[model samples]
Target chain A: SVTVIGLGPMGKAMAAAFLEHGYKVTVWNRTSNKADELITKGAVRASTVHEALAANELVILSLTDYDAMYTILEPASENLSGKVLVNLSSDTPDKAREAAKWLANRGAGHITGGVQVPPSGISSTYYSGPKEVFEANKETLEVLTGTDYRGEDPGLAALYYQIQMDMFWTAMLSYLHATAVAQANGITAEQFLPYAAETMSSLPKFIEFYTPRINAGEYPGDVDRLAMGMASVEHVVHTTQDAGIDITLPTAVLEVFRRGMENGHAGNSFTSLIEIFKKS
Target chain B: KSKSVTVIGLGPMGKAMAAAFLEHGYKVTVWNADELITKGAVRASTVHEALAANELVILSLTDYDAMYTILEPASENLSGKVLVNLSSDTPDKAREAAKWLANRGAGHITGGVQVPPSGIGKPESSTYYSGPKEVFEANKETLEVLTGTDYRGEDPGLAALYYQIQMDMFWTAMLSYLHATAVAQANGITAEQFLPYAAETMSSLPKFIEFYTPRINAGEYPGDVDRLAMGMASVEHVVHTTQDAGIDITLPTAVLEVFRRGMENGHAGNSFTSLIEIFKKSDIRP
Candidate 1:
C-alpha cells in the first residue's frame, strides 16, 4: 500500500503502475481532477494531505521539484512521523540534501529519486537516500521502474540526474542547431534525417575512444589535434553565418576550440579541450 | 607509363594522401612551400613542375586563398589538367575555385575528405566529390586511391556544402560533450567514472533525431510528452548547476537563451523542436 502525492503525468503513471500490481494506492494532488481517472482504477483518493500521509507508511512524492514537495507536505508535518518519503522530484543535489535534512528533522525518512525516462518510463527510475529505507521498499519501487540504488547520500540521485540532463539538453540542442543549418540550405529535416542520425550515432564511439585518454590526461595529436579541430569548427561557423541561420551554437564551439589552441594544445588531441572546459 | 599523380601542399593530409597513392603503386609527385619531406615520392622543384607532373593534381592547401596564391603563379600551365582540390574551405569558395579553374581550361573536381590524414588509405573511409559528373566518374578510381568516393552532384559546391554541414554537427556535438564533461568533473566525477553515462546519453541522440524528424518536416510539434516550458526550467537548472560548480556558463547560457527565445515566440507549450523555428528565423551574428 502506497500514498502517491502530486499526480502529475509521471505521478499518475507511477500510481497506475502500482495499482496494476494490485497494491492498494492512495492518491492526492492540488488539482483534484488529476486524481479522477486514477480513482476509477481502484486508487483511493485522499480527502486531504494529512489523510494521505496517515493512510500509508510509503508516500511517493512526484512533484515538479523539491520546492513543490515542501509546498505540499509542510502543512501536514504533524502526520509525517514514521513516514518514508520517496521523493522522485527533480532538483539540484544541494536541494535534495537540504530536503533530506528537512525531512529528518520531522522524524521522516527520505529517499531521493531521479526518473530517467518519461511518464511512460516510470518503471525505470534511479533512487538514492538511506540504504535501509531503500531496502525496505525495494520491491515496491521496482513496480514503477527498474530501481538503481546509488548510495546513502540523498543528493547522489539528484547529481546523477543532473549529470544525464546536462548531456541530454546540450546534445539535443546540437541536433537542432545542425538541423537549422540543413534547413537553411534547402534541405528538409527528413532528407537530412539519416545523416543527422549518423552524426549522432558516431558520438558514442568517440566517447568510448576518448574516455581512457581523458582519464589519463593524455592527449596525443597522433589522431586529431586541436589546431585541426579549430580549423574545422571555423568552417562550420562560416557555414552557419553564410546561411544566415543562428550562429550561437557553432560560435560557442569555435570559442572552445580557440581556447584550446590558445592554451598551447594546438599540437594535442581535441580531447585536450576538456582541460580548457575544466578551467572555467 | 606509371600511373603518376601530383600532390601540392605537403601538409599532414597531403603527405598521407601522397603516401596512400604511393602505396597503391602510383608515381607520386609532392610539393609544398615549406621545406617538406615525405618518403617514397618524387619531390617537385616548383609549383609549375608539380602542376605539370601529372594531369591529376591534388591541392591540399590551407584554403582557397592558399590555392590562389600558389596556382595563380602557374596559371599558364594549368590547361587540360584535372585539379582535385581537397583543401578545407567554404562552399562558395569551392564554387569560385571551380569557375577559376574552368576559365583556365582546367577540369575542377572539388573534394571534401570526411576523415583525417590518418584515415587517408583506409578502404572504408570516404571523401565527398562534386563537379562535372563525367569528370568525377573518370577520376573515381584515382580518387579511390586516397579513399572511397561519394560523388554528391555536379554543382561543384555540393560536396563542400555536405562537408560543412557534417562539420557543423560534429564540432557542436563534440563541444557539448566537452561541456558536459566539465560539469561532471566539477561535481567530483572523473572522466572515466562518467564515461558510460556520457556514452549512454550520446547514444540516445540518434533516437531523438529520428523521433523529431517527422515532426520537424510536418511542422507539427506536440507537447504531450515534453514541452518547451519544461525544457526552459531544466535548462535553468543546468545553468545554475554550472554556475554553482564555478565553471563557465557560456554553453548552457546559450542554450537557455535559445529556449527563452522559443518561449518568447509563444512556443512554451510546444515540443523542443519548436526551438528550430527560432533558429530558422534568428540571424545571429557571431
Candidate 2:
C-alpha cells in the first residue's frame, strides 16, 4: 500500500499511475477537498495525515516547497518510522541533501527527486535518481519513470537536471543572440536559419579536430593561429562597437585573444589559451 | 585549325590568358601596351591591327575605362568580332559597357576571371563567368579549350557580384567564429571544451534562426508560431550568463537590446528576425 501526500497536479498524476499499476493508494492533501476527486476514483481518502501514513509502508510526498512539506508533516513526524518515503519535489541539490538527512533521522529511507515534465508526468524516459535506492525499488519506481540510476548521492538527480537545463538554456540563448544580430543586419531570421544550421553543424567536427591539440597544449601554426584570428576578433569588436552596439560577449572574448596577442602568442592557435582555465 | 582570337591588355592576367590560348594551339594575336608579349600574337601595333586580325577579342583590363580607351578609337575595325570584357566592375557598368561595345559593330560579352595569380592556367582554378548566354554559347567550344566556364546569363556584373557576396559571407563568418572561441577562453573554457558546445549550438542555429526571416522581409511578423518576445527573453539569458561568467559581452548585448526594443514596441510577437526593421530605423544599413 502506498500513501501519496500533497495533492498538487503532479502528486495526483503520480497517485493515478501507481493506482493504475494496482498498488492500493491512500491520499492526503493540505485541504480536504483537494483529495475529493482521487477519493471518487477508488483511492482511500485519508481524513487525517496520520491515517494516510498508518495505511501504507511506502509514502510519496510531493509539495510546493520543502518547508511546506515539513510544516504539513510536523505533527505526524512520529508516523514516519519504518516507512520507505520518497520525496518527489522540486528542490536544489543542497535542499535535497539536507532533506534526505532529516528524513533519515526519522527512521525513513529517503529518496529525493523531481520530475522533468509538467503535471502529465513521465511514465518512462530518462529519469535520474540515487543508484542503490533506484536499483532496489526498480519494479516500483518504474511507474514514475524508467530507472536510470544517475548517482548514489540523493542530490545527484537534481544536479543533472540543473546542469542539463543550463546547457539547454545556454544553447537557446546563443541561438537567439546570433539570430538577433543577423536580423538587425537585414537578413531576416528565417533566411538565416538554413545557413545558421549549416554553420553550427560543423562545430562537432571542429571540436573533434581541435580539442586534442588544445588539450595537449600544442596549438597549431597553420589554418589560422592567434595573430590573424586576434586581429579578426578585434575587428568584430571594432565593427560592432563602432555601430554603438553592445559588445559584451564578443568584447570579453577579445580581451582573452588580446592577452594571447600581448604574450606574443598571437601567432599560435586560439586553442593555446587553455592555460587560462588552469589559473587558480 | 585554331580559333581566331585577339588578346587585349598586356597585364599579367591578360598575358597569361593570351599565353594559355597560344599554348592550346589557338591562332592568338595579342595586343598590349608593352609590345613584347605580342611577340607571337600576329602583333597588333594598334586596336585596328588587332580587331582586323580576329573575330573574337578578349579584353582583360582593370575597368571599363581602360576597355573604352582601347575599343573606342578602333571601333570601325570590329566588324563581326565578339568583345569579351573581363574587368572588375559593377553589374550596371558591365551591362552598359556591353551596350557600348555592341553599338560599335561588335558582339559584346562580359566575363569575370575567378582565380589567384598562382592559380592561372590550372583547369580547376580557371573559370570564366561569362555575361551573355548567347555569346557564351557561340564560343562554348573555343572557351572549353581553355578551362571551365560559368554562365552568369546576360548581366556581366552578376558574376562579379556573386563572387563578392560569397567572399563577404565567408570572411565574416570565419572571423566571427574565431572571435567567439577567443571569448570562450576568457570565460575559463578552453577553446577545445567550449568549442564542441559552441560549434554544435551554432551549427543548429542557422536553421531555426532562419525560420523567422520571411516575416522580417515581408514585414508581416505573425507571432503565432514564434515571436521576438521569446527571442528577447533568450537575449536576456545570454547577456546575464556572459556577464556572470565575467566575459565582456558588450557589442552583442547592445545588438540584443535593439531587438528587445523592437519587441517592446509591440513587435514582441512578430517573428524575431524582424530585427532588421529596427536596424533600418537606426543608422546602420545592414
Candidate 3:
C-alpha cells in the first residue's frame, strides 16, 4: 500500500489518480477533515504520519513546499528509513536537490517530483522525479506523465517548471503589452483578439527557420537578413515614438538589429544572430 | 435577387453607404436622426421601420453612443437581421455593442472602409468586416455591392481588430521611414539612396518577427544557436554608428543596454530571445 500524505487539493487529485489506476492507497492529512472525502472511496485514512508510514512501503508527499515537507517529516526521520519517499512538491531546483540529500541521510530512498497540470492531474502531462525510484516505479510513474522523462537528474523537474513559467509569463506579458499599445492608439480589447491570435500563430514558424542559422554560426541574407530586418525595426521604433507611445521594450531590440547592419554586416545575411556579436 | 440593406445615421459616410446599396440594386432603406440627411434613400421615420425594411443594417456614426441610441430603441426591428456596423471605433466597444444587438435578436457584423465618404462604391474602395461566418456567407453577394468586402471573421469585433492591427503596421513602417530619413540626413546620406536597403529591410520584418516569437514563447532560448556575445558586438556598432551620424538613436541604443545586461548575467550562451526576459522585468527606453 502507498501512503499519500497531505490532502491539499493537488494531493487529493494525485491520490485519486493513483486510486483510479487501482493502487492500494493510504492517505493522511494534518487537518484530518481534508481526508474525509477520500476515506469513503476505499482509501485508508491514517490518524498520524507514523501510522501511515508504518503501513506502507512507499510514501508520497504533496506538501505545500520544501519547508512544509521538512516540518512534517523532520521529527520522524528515523521512521522514514527503508521507505521509498516520493516528494511531489513545487519548489526551486536548489531546494529539491537539498531535500533529496536530507531524505537520503535519514536512510530513506527519495525522489522529488513536480506536477505541471492543474487539479485534474491529467496524468498524461509532465511530472518529474528522482531517477532510481522513477526507474523502479516506471510502471506507476507512467500513470502520471505518460512516457516522458527529462532524465534522472533530481533537479530536472524544478528546472522544467521554471522554464514552463518563462513561456507562460512571457506570452502573457507580450499579450498585455500589445493590449496596452492598442489602447494607446484607441483600439479596444475586443478588436485585438482575432488579429493577435492570427499573428501569434505565425510566430512559431520563424523560430524553426531562424534557430539553425544562429546555431550554425551562419548569418545568411537573401531569404531574410539583418540589413533588411533593421529597416522595419527603425520604422517601428520611430512610429512608436511619433505616436507618442513608449518605445522602451521594442526599441531596445530594434537597436541591436540596427547595430548588426551598421557594422557593415548589412551585406551579410539576416539570420546571422552571430553578427550581433561579430560587429565592431 | 434583391438584398435588403438598412443604413443608420445618414452622415456623409453613412449616406454614401446607403447610396452604394441603392446603386448596387439592394432595397436600401436608410435611417437618420436628421431626416434631411436621408434625402435619397427610403427615410425610415422610426427605428422599427428601418429594421423591417432590410435584412442588414449598416451603421455609420460619429461614435458608438450614436449607434446604440438607435439600436436600443429599435430592439423590435432587430430580430434575425444582420447589423453591418461600418462605424469606426475601438474593437472592444464594437464587440459590446455587438452583444447588445445580439441580445435583441440581431446578428452583429462590424466593418469599415479604408477610404473616406466619396470612395464607398468606387472600384478602388475596400470594405472589411468581422462577424459570424454564416452571416457573412449568406450576404456574400450582397456584401460585394459596397466595393470589395473582406470577411475578416465571425466575431463582430474582428473587423475593428483587423483595422487597428493593419493601421499599427502601416504607421510603424511609416515611422521607420521617418527615422531612417533623420539618420540619413544627419549622416549626409539621402533618404532616396537609403530606400533600397530600407525597403528591403521592411519587407523581411514579417519573417524576422515570425522567427523570434517562438523562441520568446518557448523560453528555452538556446544560446549556442544565437549567442548573446555575438549580438552584443553588433549593438555596440549601432551605438557608434548613430553617434557618428550625429543622430539620436536613443531608442534602439536602449535595447543594447538590456542585452548587455543579459550577457553580463551569463546569458552569453543563450539566444537573443532571452532579451525578452529583460524587457519583461524592467522598463525600457529607446
Candidate 3 residue lDDT tens string, A1-280:
5778888766787778778867678888766675477777668876667778878778878876678888878767779898888787656556677888888888888776766555653443334456666678667766655545555666656544433332222233344345445545455545555555544444344444444454455656746555545654554454345335455645554665666667777767654433343333
Clashing pairs in 1: A123-A144, A123-A145, A124-A145, A280-B248
lDDT of 1 by residue, A1-280 (tens): 8888888888888888888878788988875565477788888887789898999999998887787778878999988989999988678888999999999999999899988888876635668898999999998888788988878888878877887887788778877877787777767888788777877778889988888888887899987878878888888888777877788877877887888888898999998887877772
Report the Cα lDDT for residue A182, model 1: 74
Give one digit per residue, the lDDT tens place, for model 3 in B237-265: 44544454454554445546656767766
Docking class of 2: incorrect
Against the correct fold, how does model 1 do in TM-score?
0.93
Give the DockQ-based CAPRI class for model 3: incorrect
Can you tell me which runs of candidate 3 are displaced by over 4 Å?
Answer: A30-35, A121-130, A183-190, A227-280, B1-286
Top-down lDDT ranking: 1, 3, 2
Across A176-278, the per-residue lDDT of candidate 2 in tens digits comes to 4444444443345555555445434545565577666765667776755677556545544443443344445455456656666776776677666444323
Off by over 4 Å in 1: A218-220, B33-40, B282-286
Per-residue alpha-carbon lDDT of candidate 2 for residues B38-59, written as tens digits (9 for 90 to 100) = 4455677778888888788888
Return the lDDT, model 3, position B272: 65
Please name the candidate that would achieve the greatest TM-score relative to the true structure. Answer: 1
Q: Is candidate 2 or candidate 3 better by DockQ?
A: 2
Every model's DockQ: 0.72, 0.13, 0.02
